[PDB]
Amino acid sequence: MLYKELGRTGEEIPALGLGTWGIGGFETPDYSRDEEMVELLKTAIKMGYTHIDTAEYYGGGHTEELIGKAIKDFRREDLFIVSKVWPTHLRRDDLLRSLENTLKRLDTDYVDLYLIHWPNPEIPLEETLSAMAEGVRQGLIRYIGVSNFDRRLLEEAISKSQEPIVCDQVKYNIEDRDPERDGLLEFCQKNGVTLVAYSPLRRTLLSEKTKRTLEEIAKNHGATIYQIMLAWLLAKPNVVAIPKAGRVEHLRENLKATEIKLSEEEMKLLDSLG
Numbered sequence: 266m267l268y269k270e271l272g273r274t275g276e277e278i279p280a281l282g283l284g285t286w287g288i289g290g291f292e293t294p295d296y297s298r299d300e301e302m303v304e305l306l307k308t309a310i311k312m313g314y315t316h317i318d319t320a321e322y323y324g325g326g327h328t329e330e331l332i333g334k335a336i337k338d339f340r341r342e343d344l345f346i347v348s349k350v351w352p353t354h355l356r357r358d359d360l361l362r363s364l365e366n367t368l369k370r371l372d373t374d375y376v377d378l379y380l381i382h383w384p385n386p387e388i389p390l391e392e393t394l395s396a397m398a399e400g401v402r403q404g405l406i407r408y409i410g411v412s413n414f415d416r417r418l419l420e421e422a423i424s425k426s427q428e429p430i431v432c433d434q435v436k437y438n439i440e441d442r443d444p445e446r447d448g449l450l451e452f453c454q455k456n457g458v459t460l461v462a463y464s465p466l467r468r469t470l471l472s473e474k475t476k477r478t479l480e481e482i483a484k485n486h487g488a489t490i491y492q493i494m495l496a497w498l499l500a501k502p503n504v505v506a507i508p509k510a511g512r513v514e515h516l517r518e519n520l521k522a523t524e525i526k527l528s529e530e531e532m533k534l535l536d537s538l539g
């Protein structure tokens with residue numbers, strides 16, 4: 266498991282997180298596979314996936330309840346648990362209520378990282394960030410960040426926040442280059458913000474031409490095209506990745522990707538696919 270520093274915190278986190286979207290349902294709760302999902306989370310954690318990415322929205326809250334059971338087999342302080350507040354809850358009272366309920370479902374006293382899940386232009390960012398700072402001051406949150414914020418909105422959040430914005434969680438993979446084109450990655454790299462890439466395998470939806478290039482590189486490394494997609498992200502300063510892995514084979518495979526060393530020419534070829 267590769268580690269990288271979170272923001273400028275002097276703290277290192279696993280550079281692969283465990284994405285939990287789908288676990289225990291999608292937009293609504295799914296109870297039908299609870300024991301199997303808890304077992305999957307424990308296995309991921311024991312394998313070294315101690316960075317866990319979830320949200321109050323996941324499974325209508327049930328994802329957090331499944332995570333809450335799974336973590337009971339481990340030392341809370343060994344885990345880096347990330348949760349997120351949905352855009353309808355960014356006013357002060359709703360945000361603190363959401364946080365508290367997230368802590369009840371996770372059955373834990375704090376989250377390591379709390380994110381604005383999506384921006385809501387109707388709710389002033391200063392109100393939202395002050396509410397989050399109240400959570401930090403009460404010991405409910407160790408660090409705060411944002412998600413789905415473009416560069417300009419990240420700059421605005423940094424200007425309105427009493428607490429450091431340690432990360433921005435955005436879609437980034439071998440075909441989705443919005444963070445590059447926006448200056449967001451470069452901004453993060455120069456300002457001590459960790460860019461957390463979600464859908465880093467693009468949910469396995471690639472084109473034929475990307476495929477041809479990934480296949481040559483994977484062959485040379487004895488790897489799958491998905492391992493190369495992850496190695497590519499992880500080779501970039503300030504980039505951490507949150508793949509969803511719902512099976513043990515994928516959890517093992519994705520962990521091995523943290524050992525791939527791409528050459529400079531490989532990086533250049535891969536950069537050029539977008």
Ligand SMILES: NC(=O)c1ccc[n+]([C@@H]2O[C@H](COP(=O)([O-])OP(=O)(O)OC[C@H]3O[C@@H](n4cnc5c(N)ncnc54)[C@H](OP(=O)(O)O)[C@@H]3O)[C@@H](O)[C@H]2O)c1
Nearest residue numbers: 284285286412463464465466467468508509510511512515
């Ligand atoms: N901030 C946000 O708004 C936001 C938005 C979307 C997602 N996220 C977070 O980021 C996570 C990742 O996003 P994502 O699930 O959309 O995309 P992803 O991780 O790129 O795609 C997951 C898909 O790839 C498969 N997979 C994983 N490892 C694989 C491997 N080695 N080979 C082949 N397939 C593999 C999974 O299959 P199996 O499950 O069958 O292994 C699953 O179908 C989410 O769980 C969530 O925590 C955040």
Ligand SMILES: [Cl-]
Nearest residue numbers: 351352353383
């Ligand atoms: Cl939305």
Ligand SMILES: [Cl-]
Nearest residue numbers: 508510516519
């Ligand atoms: Cl994974």
